[PDB]
Every structure is written in C-alpha cells, then in structure tokens.
Amino acid sequence: LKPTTFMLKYDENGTITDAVDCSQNPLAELKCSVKSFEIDKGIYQTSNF
Amino acid sequence: AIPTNFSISITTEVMPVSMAKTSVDCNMYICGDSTECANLLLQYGSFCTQLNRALSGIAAEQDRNTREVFAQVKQMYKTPTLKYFGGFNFSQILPDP
Ligand SMILES: *[C@@H]1O[C@H](CO)[C@@H](O[C@@H]2O[C@H](CO)[C@@H](O[C@@H]3O[C@H](CO)[C@@H](O)[C@H](O[C@H]4O[C@H](CO)[C@@H](O)[C@H](O)[C@@H]4O)[C@@H]3O)[C@H](O)[C@H]2NC(C)=O)[C@H](O)[C@H]1NC(C)=O
Ligand SMILES: *[C@@H]1O[C@H](CO)[C@@H](O[C@@H]2O[C@H](CO)[C@@H](O[C@@H]3O[C@H](CO)[C@@H](O)[C@H](O)[C@@H]3O)[C@H](O)[C@H]2NC(C)=O)[C@H](O)[C@H]1NC(C)=O
C-alpha cells in the first residue's frame, strides 16, 4: 500500500463503481483537479511544480 | 450667419485596451523555500487553487479584450504599392517594405 489520492464515484445505491489514480499520468491528475470523468477540450490550469 | 469657407482637422484619441496578465506561485511567496511552511499551509486548504482560477480568468479576458476589438475582418488584405492617391499621401500610416 502507498499513500496516494483517489477519487470515487458512488452510484444511486451507494456502490463504488469507478475510481481513478491521481498519480499515474497528467491526464488522471487533470481528472482529479477538475473533479469529473469526462473532460472537454481545452487547456486547464492545475497545481504548481 | 452662415459659414462659407471651412477647415479639416485630424484629432488623436488614446484608449487603453489591455493589462499585463500575471500569475503567482504560492510557496515561492507565502512559504519561501521552507518545507515547514508547506507542512503548515495544507491546514488552510486549496486557496492556491481558487486564486489561480481567478487570475487566469482575468488572463482569459485580457486576450478576449484585444480579440474582440481587432478580429473583425475576414480577408487579410494587401497593402497597395502606391501610397499617394490624388493628394492623399499614406506614407506615414501604411508600413514600408
Ligand atoms: C509623401 O510623404 C512622404 C513623407 O515621408 C515623402 O517622402 C519623403 O520625401 C522627402 C523629399 O520630398 C525625402 O527626403 C529626401 O530623401 C532622400 C532619400 O532618403 C534623402 O537622400 C534626402 O536627403 C538629402 O537631401 C536633403 C536636401 O537636399 C538633405 O537635407 C539631406 O541631408 C541629404 O543631403 C532627403 O532627406 C524623405 O526621405 C521622404 N521620406 C520617406 C519616408 O519616403 C514623399 O515625398 C511624399 N510623396 C508625395 C507624392 O507626396
Ligand atoms: C439500485 O437498487 C434498486 C433495488 O435495490 C434497483 O432497482 C431494481 O432494478 C432492476 C433493474 O431494472 C429491476 O428489475 C426489473 O424490474 C422491472 C419492473 O418491476 C421488471 O419488469 C423487470 O423484469 C426486472 O425484474 C428491479 O425491479 C428494481 N427493484 C427495485 C426495488 O426498484 C436499481 O436499478 C439500482 N440502481 C442502480 C443505479 O444500481
């Protein structure tokens, strides 16, 4: 186990249906920042470096 | 009274359209090279998130201002080779190859 950050989608019936890493690629971290699974085109600012 | 002769005036006009868009890293400023600040900042939360959204939102408008003024033509026209047109010497307003 490793200290990470995930993001979980619950359904109507309180079931974990989908997850995402915040560490594997910049694309998933974009999903972590905007807090959405589907992302339209464009640039989006995220955290610093 | 009715005027007979006339004159022709050219009057200048100055208007601002934009402003230098900025950006601020938090930890370079509010922390400033110390990890323990960054070990303390996370109690306050993602205020770095909201201000980056705000300042970039200003930055989107600054390009939006310039674009909404200028980008109105749809053909990129060519400057003619002549610059003097029947007493109309455009030698100061047109560019020069
Ligand atoms: C439309 O308007 C433009 C306005 O710029 C005008 O162009 C200018 O014309 C004058 C002459 O009428 C030019 O002045 C001369 O240009 C030549 C070439 O550069 C220079 O060598 C000359 O310098 C010598 O001669 C002078 C007097 O004998 C000396 O004082 C000097 O030290 C040199 O010995 C002289 O400067 C000027 O350069 C142009 N400028 C431009 C940007 O073209 C044009 O004539 C007008 N046309 C019409 C049809 O109205
Ligand atoms: C969340 O859970 C509820 C129940 O725990 C789910 O409702 C159930 O959905 C199924 C699928 O449609 C239903 O089965 C069908 O019912 C219809 C109508 O009676 C019948 O014609 C079909 O042949 C089939 O049997 C089931 O009846 C229904 N039960 C209840 C109590 O509503 C619901 O779909 C779940 N939703 C999610 C997003 O998980």
Count the alpha carbons within 13 Å of B8 in the hemisphere toward its beta carbon.
Answer: 0
CA of A13 from ligand 2 middle (Å) equals: 11
CA-based torsion, B51, B57, B60, B64: positive or negative: negative
Count the alpha carbons within 13 Å of B66 in the hemisphere toward its beta carbon.
Answer: 9
- Number of neighbours of residue A6 by Cβ within 10 angstroms: 10
Distance CA A27, CA B1 (A): 77
Distance CA B53, CA B39 (A): 23
Single-letter amino acid, residue A11: D
- Number of neighbours of residue B5 by Cβ within 10 angstroms: 4
| B86 in contact with ligand 1, CB cutoff 6 A | no
Q: Any residues with CB less than 8 A from the CB of B62 and at least 6 apart, and which?
A: B18, B19, B21
Determination technique used: cryo-EM
CA-based torsion, B21, B26, B28, B31: positive or negative: positive
* Helices and strands in chain A, H and E counts: 1, 2
Single-letter amino acid, residue B58: I
Beta carbons of A42 and A49 less than 8 angstroms apart = no
Q: Which of B25, B27, B56 sits opposite A45 (nearest CB)?
A: B56
Distance CA A41, CA B25 (A): 25
Beta carbons of A48 and A33 less than 8 angstroms apart = no
- Can you give the resolution of this entry in Å? 4.4
Q: Which of A5, A34, A48 to mutate to test the interface with B (most CBs of B within 10 A)?
A: A48
Beta carbons of B32 and B41 less than 8 angstroms apart = no
